[PDB]
Amino acid sequence: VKKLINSQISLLIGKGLHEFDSLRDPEVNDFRTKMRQFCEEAAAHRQQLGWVEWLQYSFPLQLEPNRALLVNVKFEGSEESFTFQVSTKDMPLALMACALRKKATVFRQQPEEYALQVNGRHEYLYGNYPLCHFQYICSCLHSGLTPHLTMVHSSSILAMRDEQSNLWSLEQPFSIELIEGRKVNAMKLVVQAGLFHGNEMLCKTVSSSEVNVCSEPVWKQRLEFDISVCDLPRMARLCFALYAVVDCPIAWANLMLFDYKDQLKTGERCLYMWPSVLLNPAGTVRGNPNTESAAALVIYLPEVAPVYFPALEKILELGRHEEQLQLREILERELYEHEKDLVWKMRHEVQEHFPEALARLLLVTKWNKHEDVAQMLYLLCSWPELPVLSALELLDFSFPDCYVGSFAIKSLRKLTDDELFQYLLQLVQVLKYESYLDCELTKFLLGRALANRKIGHFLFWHLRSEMHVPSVALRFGLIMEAYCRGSTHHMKVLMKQGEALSKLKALNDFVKVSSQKTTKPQTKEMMHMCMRQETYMEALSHLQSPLDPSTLLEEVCVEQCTFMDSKMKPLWIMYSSEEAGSAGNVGIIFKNGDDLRQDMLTLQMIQLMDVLWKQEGLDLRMTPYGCLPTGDRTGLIEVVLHSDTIANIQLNKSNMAATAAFNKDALLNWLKSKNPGEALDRAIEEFTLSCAGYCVATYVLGIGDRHSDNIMIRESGQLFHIDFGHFLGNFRVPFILTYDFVHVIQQGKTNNSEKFERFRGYCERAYTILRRHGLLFLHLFALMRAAGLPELSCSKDIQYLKDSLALGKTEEEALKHFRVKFNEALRESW
Numbered sequence: 001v002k003k004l005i006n007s008q009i010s011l012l013i014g015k016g017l018h019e020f021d022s023l024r025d026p027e028v029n030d031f032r033t034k035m036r037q038f039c040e041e042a043a044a045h046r047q048q049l050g051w052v053e054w055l056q057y058s059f060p061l062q063l064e065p066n067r068a069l070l071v072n073v074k075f076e077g078s079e080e081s082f083t084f085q086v087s088t089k090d091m092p093l094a095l096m097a098c099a100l101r102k103k104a105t106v107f108r109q110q111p112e113e114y115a116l117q118v119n120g121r122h123e124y125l126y127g128n129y130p131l132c133h134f135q136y137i138c139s140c141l142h143s144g145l146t147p148h149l150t151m152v153h154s155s156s157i158l159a160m161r162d163e164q165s166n167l168w169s170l171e172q173p174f175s176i177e178l179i180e181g182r183k184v185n186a187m188k189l190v191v192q193a194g195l196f197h198g199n200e201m202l203c204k205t206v207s208s209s210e211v212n213v214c215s216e217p218v219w220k221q222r223l224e225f226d227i228s229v230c231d232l233p234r235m236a237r238l239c240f241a242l243y244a245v246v247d248c249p250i251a252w253a254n255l256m257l258f259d260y261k262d263q264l265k266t267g268e269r270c271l272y273m274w275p276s277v278l279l280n281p282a283g284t285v286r287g288n289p290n291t292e293s294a295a296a297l298v299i300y301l302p303e304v305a306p307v308y309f310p311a312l313e314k315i316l317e318l319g320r321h322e323e324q325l326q327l328r329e330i331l332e333r334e335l336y337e338h339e340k341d342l343v344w345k346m347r348h349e350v351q352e353h354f355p356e357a358l359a360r361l362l363l364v365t366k367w368n369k370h371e372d373v374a375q376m377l378y379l380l381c382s383w384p385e386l387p388v389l390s391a392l393e394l395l396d397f398s399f400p401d402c403y404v405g406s407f408a409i410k411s412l413r414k415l416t417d418d419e420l421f422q423y424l425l426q427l428v429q430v431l432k433y434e435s436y437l438d439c440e441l442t443k444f445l446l447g448r449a450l451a452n453r454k455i456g457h458f459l460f461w462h463l464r465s466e467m468h469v470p471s472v473a474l475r476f477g478l479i480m481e482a483y484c485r486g487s488t489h490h491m492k493v494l495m496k497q498g499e500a501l502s503k504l505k506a507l508n509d510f511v512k513v514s515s516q517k518t519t520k521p522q523t524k525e526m527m528h529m530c531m532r533q534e535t536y537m538e539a540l541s542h543l544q545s546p547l548d549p550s551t552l553l554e555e556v557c558v559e560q561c562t563f564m565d566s567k568m569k570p571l572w573i574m575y576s577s578e579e580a581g582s583a584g585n586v587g588i589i590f591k592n593g594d595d596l597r598q599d600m601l602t603l604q605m606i607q608l609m610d611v612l613w614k615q616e617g618l619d620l621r622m623t624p625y626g627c628l629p630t631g632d633r634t635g636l637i638e639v640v641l642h643s644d645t646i647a648n649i650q651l652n653k654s655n656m657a658a659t660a661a662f663n664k665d666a667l668l669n670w671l672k673s674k675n676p677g678e679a680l681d682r683a684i685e686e687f688t689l690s691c692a693g694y695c696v697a698t699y700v701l702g703i704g705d706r707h708s709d710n711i712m713i714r715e716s717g718q719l720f721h722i723d724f725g726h727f728l729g730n731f732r733v734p735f736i737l738t739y740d741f742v743h744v745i746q747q748g749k750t751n752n753s754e755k756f757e758r759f760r761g762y763c764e765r766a767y768t769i770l771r772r773h774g775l776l777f778l779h780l781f782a783l784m785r786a787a788g789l790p791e792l793s794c795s796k797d798i799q800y801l802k803d804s805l806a807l808g809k810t811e812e813e814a815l816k817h818f819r820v821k822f823n824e825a826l827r828e829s830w
């Protein structure tokens, strides 16, 4: 049983558990055991949870960020149902009470003993919330559809639970012995070495002597740093760069000066270097696992004798020891040395009256002076809990201190499961900045994953998608193993998704081959013939959607499956569910060959924009569809059904009802056929609302190469963008407006200023709302720099956001510049 589970984790994570053992690494073995226990403790707490608490784990509530409606209800072991006319203001309890009353009359004779399952979905309705606060109810109030729900008794949820169980004394300078190399280049070799605490140098970067190019260069040179051994901060990083000069970079490598047990390192170290794109402080402190092709830098850390980093009780003991200022008020809304001295002097007054300025003072503390650090740490240890927004900033590489990091985690505990889900992608990326395997962020990510099955799901996939990346393969694999130990049943549920994805990779490889060799109907027929095989039928059916674990992908609709003509021949896979009805008619797009990490970020940023607008009582009818990277240049996209491209509608194909005399009318003619009579006016308003949100979103995010093939419309009138290959103006893009879209907004009239001026106001509002949250976008995109995205490489990518959101300016200057940008787009629109 314990063996099968081990062989199951190895297959699921993609790395044999034997590989973790073969390292003989005390750091790896300590994490594995400690985390396993932590995760088994979390699995044990789950089985003693009440049946409602376990519903909150397995099926977290999908909520929205007077008017009656039909609702169809049935009980678990029966085909018999009942349709009620309930209210949107009614709680699930009133609905369940009605449902029990109808059962009593029919069966000829307690609501609190039940929960309402969404038919053929892992989504439930419970809690003291009116029906219109539920995402599903709204997914029915807008599509016009009738909600279908099932009464599930407490004992039936408890049957589910059960089946789902398992020092300051050393004032001498820091120096090293640079022994030799084992590399390749075309010229002389030089080694640059620097000591860092995050983004900043602790002292000036020291260089090596020029040694002539060869495969095994020798230096045996002592490199001395302008810093005392007693002044090395705990998270100090000794960074190396190997380059060939007459400059040409070759390789880089980093290492922490203290180990995971806080002991200062001695003596011989062999550094398996990483290929270069000069000094890279942000890069991994673990050497290249490719010890066969990797260049190796041999160094010696000289013995100073065992020296451990002083415990917090020693740091604290040390640390304890005019109206003109502020002054510091005016610089607290990127500063000179005199202003940094002001902040350091005022450090106590910052804790007292500006706790949120913690990040500004953390940047001014002299981390290369052990007494200056202790003083900061004494203040930090009494520092009030910071807001989530300020805490998100402290996760950055600019704040590498472990005590700062621990303080940031302590402040993100108050994060709701909804807020955590929204920023889960960025928190996972921050793991790349981590210096040790055992960290507060891993423990936080795991603890929250094991207490919420949806968080658990996405933590797994974010990590699993990066297993082909050698710099994060050990960390991510170890975290996923610890997770699986905390959820044996979820492990198998995820295995079912990997098996389905394995079949789609094999199926898509054939589609790629066949498309270059025969006609599309010939390829489609054999794709279908291959799908109908027992192993493909078994693997592609009855799984949880990796895009949303609450979507149940039941029976695969082979006849409705196809592939798109684009570069990578993406697979279009359709599913159906008898039990779910129309909610079970769901599609997935399997794309293989492109990097979907950016597309996901872009879709997540739009999803956030929609959330923020909804918070301010604005629903700009956005379509933030799923996009999940699953593997190496592999992922899934959610099919937005009953939609088509602008190019397909505008292609003006004959015989159809959408036939237009003029191109400008093609969109409005298509909407007239999909929404006839009284339904048209509703479609136009959906179009206008969705158009305004995407106008602002694409402008703020700087989305370029926008044509009729990457813009879509739902039959409801809602416009949305697809295929986000590029963002942040990276090929300063303007605001975009189209005459044919402006035509739909103006009701199909050449002149209709009342409709266009309403539209212009939507664009202004949406923009002004996002501007207030401009710092959230800044912090989240700054965190996303860790990912390794070519279009989010530096500060010049972060700058696009600053300018698109006009963050340095006031609202009146920003709204004027937006009015200038909107009119520039209108004049350009013919």
Ligand SMILES: Cn1nc(-c2cnc(N)c(-n3ccc(C(N)=O)n3)n2)nc1C1(c2ccccc2)CC1
Pocket: 562, 563, 564, 565, 572, 589, 599, 625, 637, 638, 639, 640, 641, 643, 644, 645, 648, 722, 723, 724
């Ligand atoms: C009817 N339909 N619906 C879609 C659609 C829906 N939802 C999406 N998310 C999406 N999509 C595509 C690529 C990306 C992306 N994010 O990269 N997103 N496409 N596409 C089609 C057409 C189609 C389908 C299948 C075969 C031929 C032709 C073109 C008509």
